Amino acid sequence: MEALGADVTQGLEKGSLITCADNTGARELKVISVHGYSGTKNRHPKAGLGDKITVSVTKGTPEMRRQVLEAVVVRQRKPIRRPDGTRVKFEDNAAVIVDENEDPRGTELKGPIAREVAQRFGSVASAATMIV
């Protein structure tokens, strides 16, 4: 994929529970896999900012629950390094549900989003309220 323009320390793993920063009706998401990723023996597949991960809905509307969908990680508590050397970290871990084309399944995104996520998922960015 395109360079994020920032170094990331994956702060998530297969099985992690994260916030669904949109109005799709899914509140909590459980990470299942990381797109294009292959680890190594004993290593828990890891995911962080800007990765497209497969997920399952743990909390939310009955119809949304248990569904296996795709999403993009928009925020993480673990720091990331920007070109100027500064580190950036968020208050929580969050992802936004996406479709085949990478267009947000929802209509509105809740909470801020990392600028680096723009250089990868345009339609997700062009739906952001706040882009830090």
Binding site: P79, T86, F90, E91, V132
Partner: protein
């Protein structure tokens, strides 16, 4: 840049920016300040802080 906490100048190529839930932003020059903040203390009440000074 200036540390949104203590007030001293943040040495370039240094520090962390914490993004609040609401979207607000806070640049810290060090762990000492971040930690003092997480304790719920306000820089104005800490005598070593440039702010307070």
């Amino acid at each position: 840049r200036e540390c949104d906490y203590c007030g001293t100048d943040i040495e370039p190529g240094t520090g962390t920016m914490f993004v609040h839930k609401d979207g607000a932003t806070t640049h810290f020059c060090s762990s000492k300040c971040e930690n003092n903040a997480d304790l719920g203390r306000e820089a104005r009440n800490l005598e070593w802080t440039d702010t307070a000074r």
